[PDB]
Amino acid sequence: PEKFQHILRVLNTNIDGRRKIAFAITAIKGVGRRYAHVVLRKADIDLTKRAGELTEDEVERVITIMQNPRQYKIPDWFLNRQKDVKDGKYSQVLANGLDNKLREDLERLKKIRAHRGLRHFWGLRVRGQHTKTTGRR
Amino acid sequence: RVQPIKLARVTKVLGRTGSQGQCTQVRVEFMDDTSRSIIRNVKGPVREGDVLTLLESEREARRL
Amino acid sequence: TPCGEGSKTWDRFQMRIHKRLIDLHSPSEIVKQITSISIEPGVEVEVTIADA
Amino acid sequence: CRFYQHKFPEVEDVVMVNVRSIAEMGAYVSLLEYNNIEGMILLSELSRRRIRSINKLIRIGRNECVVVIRVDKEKGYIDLSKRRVSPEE
Amino acid sequence: VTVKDVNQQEFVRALAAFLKKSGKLKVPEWVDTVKLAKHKELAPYDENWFYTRAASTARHLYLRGGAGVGSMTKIYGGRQRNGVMPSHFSRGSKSVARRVLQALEGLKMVEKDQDWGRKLTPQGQRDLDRIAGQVAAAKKK
Amino acid sequence: MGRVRTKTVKKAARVIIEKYYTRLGNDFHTNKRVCEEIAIIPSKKLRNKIAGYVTHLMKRIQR
Amino acid sequence: HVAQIYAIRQSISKALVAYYQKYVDEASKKEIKDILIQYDRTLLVADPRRCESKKFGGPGARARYQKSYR
Amino acid sequence: VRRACYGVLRFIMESGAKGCEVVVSGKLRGQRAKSMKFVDGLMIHSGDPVNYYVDTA
Amino acid sequence: RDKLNNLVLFDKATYDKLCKEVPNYKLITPAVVSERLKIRGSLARAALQELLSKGLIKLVSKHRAQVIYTRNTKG
Amino acid sequence: TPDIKLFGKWSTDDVQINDISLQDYIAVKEKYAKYLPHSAGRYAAKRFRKAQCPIVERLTNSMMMHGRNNGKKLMTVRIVKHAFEIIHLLTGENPLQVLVNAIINSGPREDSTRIGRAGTVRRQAVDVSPLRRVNQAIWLLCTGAREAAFRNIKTIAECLADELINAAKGSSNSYAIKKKDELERVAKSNR
RNA sequence: CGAGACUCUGGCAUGCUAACUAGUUACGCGACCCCCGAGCGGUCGGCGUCCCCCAACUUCUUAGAGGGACAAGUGGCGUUCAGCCACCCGAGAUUGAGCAAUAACAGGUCUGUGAUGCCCUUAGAUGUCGGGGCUGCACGCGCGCUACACUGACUGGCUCAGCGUGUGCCUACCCUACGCCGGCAGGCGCGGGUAACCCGUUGAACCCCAUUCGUGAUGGGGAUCGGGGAUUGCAAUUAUUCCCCAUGAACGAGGAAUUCCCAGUAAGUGCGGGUCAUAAGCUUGCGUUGAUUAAGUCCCUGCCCUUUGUACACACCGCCCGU
């Protein structure tokens, strides 16, 4: 019966009680359920609680660990982009900046005219799998 | 219009009628009266000696 | 069915191979000798030097 | 709520029912004459003729003039007919 | 007694706590970010479970004539979600199970013996029985 | 309902009853063995149906 | 798990009776047989029911694939 | 066709047979198919004893 | 179908309401408490776990899926 | 134990059948008392067999319906045992007595069977067998409990308990009662 | 003649004969020995390994010969017959396959067939290698699969199986206990086993349990897409496949319509085998958890009985008329 602590920001979304902390965070892009769960474990925060619980302190501690993942022993395999294509590292991409890179890669392979690029642009299915009577109604 | 509820007990399962064969004729001893004994059709499976709760003897239930 | 139209009809054949062994203990040759003779067709019989 | 002082209709009261959805026996309609109280139409009596038609481009949001047969103030069920209608046009 | 006579759920919990008291479990440099098994759709709640697993493994080995990684992996294993295909059995993480076997061996709860893999140590036999007694008084369910 | 006797059973039964009247009993078990002695019947189910009907016949016959 | 429960119950009651039938006395075993058999649970007579064979042209034993018709 | 069938059928029956049947199938007389059955004796198709009792080629 | 949500913040007023409504209950489960208040269902549950260290509620089930509490001994 | 065979934490004693027409398909102690319901898992072996099965066992069986929940008796036994406890807190009493009352009040008397009459929609008023009245009642009540639980916080145990109590003495918040009143009303009418 | 009968499988044989590629019992039981409990303790009971016999057995396990079901016993009913109903014993006159006549069909197949007629082509191939497509999607259909959640999503934990199968093979090759490393995919070292010896005491999934979540498209759901790691192959581009993370769709119960189902059955649930260098959302069996319901009838439908009518006979999807 503790209100009191409420209204937390992770990146560009308002995070309040609704679900357990981990799930609450995943409003933003680049943070799945598994990502937010493992960040909280690293940051020594009980993740069973609500996001209308916990103060501003805990939030900042989460933000620092997510955006410096290697330097807090979140390994390279766990990352959304490994080695990347723009950047020679290994970067966790979050929020609006994921949308940027997705656009980049699709444009990139239209220039280079690679099969992935062309198919996606034309609206054909990028994977070689059937689209015979599927990929519509 | 209205009559009192009559308990009547299955004396003899007469056989089965119905177009699909899913209506069973029954003769029920009127229980209150041994003089009356009247034929009413039961929808369910009937085992002799079980008791119906007749709400009418109006609108006689009969072969079809 | 060759050429599959119609209905799904499946055929299942079995073949039931039967095995048995018998361990005799007694001396060397006269075992395998007296046993393996007097039979020729259609039932395999193997006499094995195995077991000490 | 409703404009009327009484909370329920009576026997052979002409009402207007909003057909919300068709399901099983007929339709669990809402009497709009008296608040939004639940009632039902068909199974036995409602139809006056059969011609094997009852809609084509008659979609939804529509409404039937009906008359009250049986009303259960306590139980909240109102058995309704449209077959009864003649001066209730 | 065998360990089976006493409450199984209470046994593993009591033994797991006894392991914590010992002060070592030779813990991995993983289990803080892990996938774990592929039967999991969410990363582990805590890093506590390693003790519980160790207790469980010790109990399982006590039953058998000796066993290694394979036995633990099937028990912890369950149904694996294959996406939009049928769910089917699999065996998950082998690094953790191997690590648990090594760690228990280090404490001398279990040791290598005949019939392959680790079988119980008399040191472990004594430990398991002491917590078995505590459990035996507590309930039977 | 099902498994009403066939002609093959009844014919054999008539045969046996006429020519072995004094030997035959009224008990299934003993008659079943008597049918082994006085005939060659290539199945036990068939022999049982024969034996069976022959007891039923003997019971009627001895009235 | 359930299969085993039913089996064990049958074997334990049968066990007791079996022991008393050859060694102790008939009246004890008979008393046990009376008490059980009345409400009944088939603990001294075998259950016939074992799996029925699957036959082709269906996904189940008696279940059969959907047909399609114009 | 009939002469050939009758001679072989009669000879096989004469050797000792409970019965026998000879079938000639295929086309004759251009573009229509025909079958003929030339049967004598007893023949079964019933259950498992058919496999045992009758030899076919 | 349906759309229904409850407050997912642990609140002041609803805890107080709970303990001072206590003669109403004789059956208490998470779901009941949740419906009768606006407390979550999860935080229904948890409020009960707190409440049980008054001992205005007594455990009579302890099942994994959901728990059943009594109010006092029997009411 | 052999003196009286109780339920697994409730009594089979003081269970009264409040109707004289529904007898011999309502039982719980007229031979058929059990700590744990289970006969042999067949009930379709004979037409005789249904009489053997008491109302309690029939209620557990009817519950497991809708594909995922099919063929899970162990889950249902746990849910049902919990449900009895929920009934006991809510009304005191014996939960089995509440169950029996609920069946009697939910069971219809007259219903209707189809009869031809010009091709117009008319039906013949008929009474139905007490076996049918019990079978239909148990169906209605299980379906009611499941229906509520589906998109609501309350579990099957709680909704089943609520469904029985409302039917036991009328409240008009029980599905089974509402359906029965429709069936009997329609029966009276007709041709 | 078909079907019945018959055969094969499933169930009833603490009777019969056997078992060291199988186990069980039963001591004496001692040791690893824990005291968990009793006993002061020796000792007794105990999941497993180990002690093993000139032990005993076939109960579980195996497969051979044997018996048991015939409506037998009894009671009602019926031409007192054929048969029917109940009752006992109990596998009950309640299992599932295998089995096909007379005759039809322009059913399918020349691409299973060095079976085959005629025709085409044939050194310029329609006889072989290099490359691509079958995998392209504004849309219609079918069998499925995954779903719509709380008998569930989630995190620990408990725990019981069966049918079958394997390398050392006549054009290509295994299952893996066990050691180590890696979240994982996977990598790497051994040893046994053509096998009830070894994989595999097949300790599988459902199930059971203490939580978390709280009915909210929510974490139900895993669509689509992006980045990366590996495995298979000489070759994966048009993801062969597998894994790791992120991106996190419709769908919250399905209209017109329509399939299948009576008991270990429907439904839930895993497993083994086949295809195979790699590749299962497939199919064939198998065990597990396991209902509600007719318990009947000919209404619709289909098929099969007499009678009757027919301008029908390539047989009503026929015929058959006038403008």
Short mmCIF file of C-alpha atoms (C1' of nucleotides) in Angstrom, two decimals, chain K:
data_model
loop_
_atom_site.label_atom_id
_atom_site.label_comp_id
_atom_site.label_asym_id
_atom_site.label_seq_id
_atom_site.Cartn_x
_atom_site.Cartn_y
_atom_site.Cartn_z
"C1'" C K 1 -20.00 -68.78 -54.15
"C1'" G K 2 -19.56 -63.91 -50.89
"C1'" A K 3 -19.93 -63.06 -45.77
"C1'" G K 4 -20.38 -66.17 -41.56
"C1'" A K 5 -17.08 -70.06 -40.53
"C1'" C K 6 -11.75 -68.84 -40.87
"C1'" U K 7 -6.90 -66.37 -39.47
"C1'" C K 8 -4.11 -62.66 -36.82
"C1'" U K 9 -3.84 -59.24 -32.69
"C1'" G K 10 -5.67 -57.42 -27.84
"C1'" G K 11 -7.61 -59.55 -22.69
"C1'" C K 12 -8.12 -64.79 -18.43
"C1'" A K 13 -4.33 -68.90 -17.00
"C1'" U K 14 0.88 -67.74 -8.94
"C1'" G K 15 -1.63 -74.48 -13.80
"C1'" C K 16 2.26 -76.91 -17.67
"C1'" U K 17 7.62 -76.62 -19.68
"C1'" A K 18 12.21 -73.34 -19.58
"C1'" A K 19 15.67 -68.83 -19.18
"C1'" C K 20 23.54 -66.24 -17.12
"C1'" U K 21 22.60 -61.57 -24.41
"C1'" A K 22 15.98 -61.42 -19.25
"C1'" G K 23 14.45 -60.61 -14.21
"C1'" U K 24 12.34 -61.79 -9.61
"C1'" U K 25 12.03 -63.88 -4.93
"C1'" A K 26 14.56 -65.52 -0.91
"C1'" C K 27 18.08 -65.85 2.60
"C1'" G K 28 22.73 -65.65 4.85
"C1'" C K 29 23.12 -60.41 4.31
"C1'" G K 30 28.19 -58.08 5.19
"C1'" A K 31 30.33 -53.60 3.14
"C1'" C K 32 29.88 -48.38 0.91
"C1'" C K 33 26.80 -47.07 6.26
"C1'" C K 34 23.05 -43.19 7.16
"C1'" C K 35 21.62 -43.50 11.70
"C1'" C K 36 16.13 -42.09 9.27
"C1'" G K 37 13.36 -45.08 12.90
"C1'" A K 38 13.12 -49.22 16.45
"C1'" G K 39 16.59 -51.80 19.63
"C1'" C K 40 21.76 -50.02 24.86
"C1'" G K 41 24.18 -51.79 20.64
"C1'" G K 42 25.25 -56.16 17.81
"C1'" U K 43 20.90 -56.33 14.93
"C1'" C K 44 16.15 -55.47 12.06
"C1'" G K 45 13.58 -52.48 7.94
"C1'" G K 46 15.50 -49.28 3.78
"C1'" C K 47 16.48 -46.28 -3.01
"C1'" G K 48 21.01 -47.94 -5.29
"C1'" U K 49 26.01 -50.19 -6.18
"C1'" C K 50 28.81 -54.22 -4.38
"C1'" C K 51 28.96 -59.80 -1.77
"C1'" C K 52 27.33 -64.04 -4.60
"C1'" C K 53 25.84 -69.66 -4.18
"C1'" C K 54 25.95 -76.55 -5.70
"C1'" A K 55 19.63 -71.38 -3.59
"C1'" A K 56 14.81 -71.12 -5.35
"C1'" C K 57 11.21 -69.33 -9.20
"C1'" U K 58 8.69 -67.91 -13.77
"C1'" U K 59 4.91 -63.60 -10.24
"C1'" C K 60 6.59 -59.19 -13.01
"C1'" U K 61 9.74 -60.09 -18.28
"C1'" U K 62 9.92 -63.69 -22.48
"C1'" A K 63 7.42 -67.55 -25.90
"C1'" G K 64 6.02 -72.28 -26.40
"C1'" A K 65 2.57 -76.08 -25.74
"C1'" G K 66 -2.88 -76.05 -22.59
"C1'" G K 67 -7.51 -74.82 -20.79
"C1'" G K 68 -11.49 -71.02 -20.42
"C1'" A K 69 -17.04 -68.48 -23.80
"C1'" C K 70 -20.63 -72.63 -25.86
"C1'" A K 71 -25.93 -67.96 -24.64
"C1'" A K 72 -22.56 -72.94 -20.77
"C1'" G K 73 -25.86 -72.94 -15.28
"C1'" U K 74 -30.28 -71.19 -13.61
"C1'" G K 75 -35.07 -68.35 -14.28
"C1'" G K 76 -38.85 -65.86 -17.74
"C1'" C K 77 -40.47 -65.53 -22.95
"C1'" G K 78 -41.22 -67.57 -27.98
"C1'" U K 79 -44.55 -71.70 -33.24
"C1'" U K 80 -41.62 -73.60 -26.46
"C1'" C K 81 -38.51 -74.09 -32.48
"C1'" A K 82 -35.01 -70.97 -34.64
"C1'" G K 83 -34.21 -67.36 -30.94
"C1'" C K 84 -34.81 -63.31 -27.27
"C1'" C K 85 -34.28 -61.11 -22.25
"C1'" A K 86 -32.23 -61.11 -17.33
"C1'" C K 87 -28.86 -63.48 -13.69
"C1'" C K 88 -23.80 -66.03 -11.99
"C1'" C K 89 -18.94 -66.85 -13.05
"C1'" G K 90 -16.41 -63.42 -15.29
"C1'" A K 91 -12.31 -61.60 -20.83
"C1'" G K 92 -19.96 -62.02 -21.58
"C1'" A K 93 -23.08 -64.38 -25.65
"C1'" U K 94 -19.94 -55.57 -25.68
"C1'" U K 95 -12.00 -55.64 -28.88
"C1'" G K 96 -9.42 -54.27 -33.32
"C1'" A K 97 -7.44 -55.70 -37.76
"C1'" G K 98 -6.70 -59.66 -42.05
"C1'" C K 99 -10.56 -61.63 -45.62
"C1'" A K 100 -13.70 -60.56 -50.60
"C1'" A K 101 -18.41 -62.86 -54.58
"C1'" U K 102 -21.42 -62.32 -59.15
"C1'" A K 103 -20.60 -58.11 -62.27
"C1'" A K 104 -19.79 -53.32 -63.67
"C1'" C K 105 -16.33 -48.61 -64.64
"C1'" A K 106 -13.38 -46.36 -71.07
"C1'" G K 107 -11.88 -44.57 -62.30
"C1'" G K 108 -6.13 -44.05 -62.07
"C1'" U K 109 -1.27 -45.85 -64.13
"C1'" C K 110 2.76 -46.49 -70.78
"C1'" U K 111 6.29 -41.51 -65.53
"C1'" G K 112 6.95 -48.78 -61.16
"C1'" U K 113 7.82 -52.21 -64.98
"C1'" G K 114 14.51 -54.26 -70.66
"C1'" A K 115 5.67 -55.87 -69.48
"C1'" U K 116 3.86 -53.99 -74.27
"C1'" G K 117 1.20 -52.37 -79.80
"C1'" C K 118 1.55 -48.42 -83.15
"C1'" C K 119 3.36 -43.58 -83.65
"C1'" C K 120 7.35 -39.68 -82.76
"C1'" U K 121 12.65 -38.81 -81.84
"C1'" U K 122 17.45 -40.97 -82.17
"C1'" A K 123 24.24 -39.77 -83.52
"C1'" G K 124 21.96 -33.01 -86.00
"C1'" A K 125 18.67 -36.65 -79.25
"C1'" U K 126 13.65 -36.78 -76.51
"C1'" G K 127 20.26 -41.31 -74.78
"C1'" U K 128 24.70 -36.96 -70.53
"C1'" C K 129 27.18 -32.54 -67.78
"C1'" G K 130 26.99 -26.62 -66.44
"C1'" G K 131 22.87 -23.04 -64.96
"C1'" G K 132 17.63 -21.65 -63.43
"C1'" G K 133 12.45 -22.79 -62.31
"C1'" C K 134 8.81 -26.26 -59.28
"C1'" U K 135 9.66 -22.16 -53.64
"C1'" G K 136 7.26 -16.34 -58.33
"C1'" C K 137 1.22 -13.56 -55.87
"C1'" A K 138 -4.44 -8.39 -57.01
"C1'" C K 139 -7.39 -13.30 -55.88
"C1'" G K 140 -10.76 -18.62 -55.27
"C1'" C K 141 -10.46 -23.79 -52.80
"C1'" G K 142 -9.06 -28.12 -49.66
"C1'" C K 143 -6.26 -31.17 -45.80
"C1'" G K 144 -3.64 -29.23 -41.83
"C1'" C K 145 -0.76 -26.51 -38.13
"C1'" U K 146 -0.56 -22.52 -34.50
"C1'" A K 147 -3.99 -19.61 -31.78
"C1'" C K 148 -7.46 -16.94 -29.11
"C1'" A K 149 -5.47 -18.11 -22.50
"C1'" C K 150 -5.64 -18.70 -15.76
"C1'" U K 151 -6.88 -27.13 -16.45
"C1'" G K 152 -2.87 -21.05 -19.08
"C1'" A K 153 1.90 -17.53 -20.01
"C1'" C K 154 6.09 -17.37 -16.46
"C1'" U K 155 10.15 -19.20 -12.60
"C1'" G K 156 12.00 -23.26 -9.55
"C1'" G K 157 11.02 -28.28 -8.07
"C1'" C K 158 8.36 -33.77 -8.18
"C1'" U K 159 7.87 -38.00 -11.36
"C1'" C K 160 5.85 -42.78 -14.54
"C1'" A K 161 6.15 -45.41 -20.05
"C1'" G K 162 5.36 -48.21 -24.46
"C1'" C K 163 5.51 -49.94 -29.73
"C1'" G K 164 9.98 -49.85 -32.27
"C1'" U K 165 15.50 -48.89 -33.95
"C1'" G K 166 20.84 -49.07 -34.47
"C1'" U K 167 27.53 -49.38 -36.79
"C1'" G K 168 31.04 -52.81 -39.05
"C1'" C K 169 25.45 -52.83 -45.02
"C1'" C K 170 26.52 -54.94 -53.30
"C1'" U K 171 27.19 -47.69 -55.54
"C1'" A K 172 26.99 -45.45 -48.69
"C1'" C K 173 27.00 -45.63 -43.15
"C1'" C K 174 24.71 -45.71 -36.71
"C1'" C K 175 22.90 -44.98 -31.82
"C1'" U K 176 25.53 -42.63 -27.89
"C1'" A K 177 26.22 -43.62 -21.87
"C1'" C K 178 30.63 -41.30 -20.00
"C1'" G K 179 35.34 -36.47 -19.65
"C1'" C K 180 36.06 -31.38 -21.03
"C1'" C K 181 34.57 -26.26 -23.37
"C1'" G K 182 30.58 -22.89 -24.91
"C1'" G K 183 23.93 -19.03 -22.59
"C1'" C K 184 23.01 -21.56 -26.97
"C1'" A K 185 23.72 -23.58 -31.67
"C1'" G K 186 27.67 -26.40 -31.50
"C1'" G K 187 32.87 -28.11 -30.78
"C1'" C K 188 36.15 -32.08 -28.77
"C1'" G K 189 38.17 -37.14 -26.32
"C1'" C K 190 36.84 -41.95 -25.19
"C1'" G K 191 34.27 -46.96 -24.81
"C1'" G K 192 30.39 -50.43 -25.83
"C1'" G K 193 26.62 -52.55 -28.76
"C1'" U K 194 24.09 -56.03 -35.65
"C1'" A K 195 21.88 -55.36 -29.93
"C1'" A K 196 16.05 -58.14 -24.49
"C1'" C K 197 24.94 -57.51 -23.97
"C1'" C K 198 25.30 -51.20 -25.59
"C1'" C K 199 22.16 -46.57 -26.60
"C1'" G K 200 18.09 -47.25 -22.48
"C1'" U K 201 17.06 -49.45 -14.60
"C1'" U K 202 14.21 -46.30 -22.18
"C1'" G K 203 12.71 -42.35 -15.18
"C1'" A K 204 9.36 -38.95 -22.09
"C1'" A K 205 5.49 -35.32 -22.40
"C1'" C K 206 0.58 -34.87 -20.17
"C1'" C K 207 0.41 -35.17 -14.98
"C1'" C K 208 1.89 -33.41 -9.60
"C1'" C K 209 3.82 -28.97 -6.74
"C1'" A K 210 5.52 -23.75 -4.16
"C1'" U K 211 5.33 -19.07 -6.66
"C1'" U K 212 4.84 -14.97 -10.16
"C1'" C K 213 1.14 -12.85 -13.46
"C1'" G K 214 -4.52 -11.51 -12.95
"C1'" U K 215 -7.96 -11.98 -17.45
"C1'" G K 216 -6.19 -6.77 -19.42
"C1'" A K 217 -4.56 -8.88 -27.68
"C1'" U K 218 -1.77 -9.11 -21.33
"C1'" G K 219 3.95 -11.70 -20.80
"C1'" G K 220 -2.07 -15.15 -24.60
"C1'" G K 221 0.03 -15.23 -30.00
"C1'" G K 222 4.66 -15.78 -32.77
"C1'" A K 223 3.48 -13.38 -37.82
"C1'" U K 224 6.64 -10.13 -40.63
"C1'" C K 225 11.46 -7.84 -40.77
"C1'" G K 226 16.75 -6.44 -39.31
"C1'" G K 227 21.77 -7.77 -37.37
"C1'" G K 228 25.09 -11.78 -35.89
"C1'" G K 229 26.90 -16.89 -34.76
"C1'" A K 230 27.08 -22.17 -36.31
"C1'" U K 231 25.74 -26.84 -38.52
"C1'" U K 232 25.04 -29.90 -43.85
"C1'" G K 233 27.19 -30.13 -48.83
"C1'" C K 234 32.49 -29.51 -53.75
"C1'" A K 235 28.15 -25.99 -54.84
"C1'" A K 236 22.49 -22.87 -50.26
"C1'" U K 237 22.04 -17.44 -54.44
"C1'" U K 238 15.70 -17.32 -53.98
"C1'" A K 239 16.71 -17.58 -45.43
"C1'" U K 240 18.30 -26.11 -47.18
"C1'" U K 241 18.36 -26.23 -41.87
"C1'" C K 242 19.77 -24.75 -36.54
"C1'" C K 243 20.67 -21.06 -32.78
"C1'" C K 244 21.06 -15.70 -30.35
"C1'" C K 245 18.99 -10.96 -29.91
"C1'" A K 246 15.75 -7.26 -31.53
"C1'" U K 247 11.49 -5.78 -34.50
"C1'" G K 248 6.22 -8.17 -31.37
"C1'" A K 249 0.66 -8.98 -36.83
"C1'" A K 250 -4.12 -10.75 -37.42
"C1'" C K 251 -6.68 -13.61 -34.05
"C1'" G K 252 -10.19 -12.06 -27.61
"C1'" A K 253 -14.54 -18.24 -30.41
"C1'" G K 254 -15.60 -17.74 -36.52
"C1'" G K 255 -21.26 -16.30 -41.34
"C1'" A K 256 -23.41 -18.84 -45.66
"C1'" A K 257 -22.15 -23.65 -44.82
"C1'" U K 258 -19.89 -28.49 -43.26
"C1'" U K 259 -16.78 -33.22 -41.23
"C1'" C K 260 -16.07 -36.99 -37.64
"C1'" C K 261 -17.28 -39.65 -33.36
"C1'" C K 262 -20.14 -44.89 -28.70
"C1'" A K 263 -14.89 -46.68 -25.00
"C1'" G K 264 -9.18 -46.99 -23.01
"C1'" U K 265 -13.59 -44.06 -27.48
"C1'" A K 266 -13.83 -38.09 -28.77
"C1'" A K 267 -10.40 -34.37 -27.06
"C1'" G K 268 -5.52 -33.12 -24.66
"C1'" U K 269 -0.26 -35.01 -24.83
"C1'" G K 270 4.60 -36.74 -26.01
"C1'" C K 271 7.54 -40.81 -28.32
"C1'" G K 272 9.77 -44.49 -32.36
"C1'" G K 273 9.99 -45.48 -37.56
"C1'" G K 274 9.75 -44.01 -43.07
"C1'" U K 275 11.71 -39.96 -46.75
"C1'" C K 276 17.24 -38.55 -45.84
"C1'" A K 277 24.32 -35.58 -47.38
"C1'" U K 278 21.39 -31.61 -45.05
"C1'" A K 279 16.21 -30.76 -44.22
"C1'" A K 280 8.68 -32.23 -41.01
"C1'" G K 281 3.98 -28.15 -39.57
"C1'" C K 282 3.55 -34.95 -43.29
"C1'" U K 283 2.14 -39.91 -42.58
"C1'" U K 284 2.30 -45.00 -40.07
"C1'" G K 285 2.16 -47.22 -35.28
"C1'" C K 286 2.79 -46.68 -29.87
"C1'" G K 287 1.94 -45.65 -24.70
"C1'" U K 288 -0.07 -41.59 -21.34
"C1'" U K 289 -4.27 -38.26 -19.31
"C1'" G K 290 -9.34 -39.24 -20.54
"C1'" A K 291 -15.27 -37.32 -20.87
"C1'" U K 292 -20.50 -35.44 -21.49
"C1'" U K 293 -23.95 -38.30 -24.80
"C1'" A K 294 -27.89 -42.52 -28.36
"C1'" A K 295 -27.95 -46.86 -25.78
"C1'" G K 296 -32.09 -45.87 -30.25
"C1'" U K 297 -34.76 -45.19 -35.09
"C1'" C K 298 -35.73 -44.80 -40.24
"C1'" C K 299 -37.10 -38.32 -40.24
"C1'" C K 300 -33.38 -36.41 -43.79
"C1'" U K 301 -29.51 -39.13 -46.48
"C1'" G K 302 -27.33 -43.63 -48.43
"C1'" C K 303 -27.87 -48.74 -49.39
"C1'" C K 304 -30.48 -52.96 -49.57
"C1'" C K 305 -36.76 -55.85 -49.48
"C1'" U K 306 -41.64 -56.74 -51.82
"C1'" U K 307 -45.53 -54.43 -54.69
"C1'" U K 308 -46.99 -50.82 -58.46
"C1'" G K 309 -46.17 -47.37 -62.78
"C1'" U K 310 -43.02 -45.92 -66.75
"C1'" A K 311 -43.47 -42.27 -73.64
"C1'" C K 312 -37.52 -44.50 -69.39
"C1'" A K 313 -33.31 -48.76 -71.73
"C1'" C K 314 -26.09 -45.05 -73.34
"C1'" A K 315 -31.65 -46.63 -68.20
"C1'" C K 316 -34.34 -39.41 -64.87
"C1'" C K 317 -27.60 -35.55 -64.92
"C1'" G K 318 -33.31 -39.91 -68.99
"C1'" C K 319 -36.99 -38.05 -71.65
"C1'" C K 320 -40.13 -34.67 -73.94
"C1'" C K 321 -43.96 -30.55 -76.01
"C1'" G K 322 -45.41 -25.81 -78.28
"C1'" U K 323 -44.34 -20.60 -79.59
#
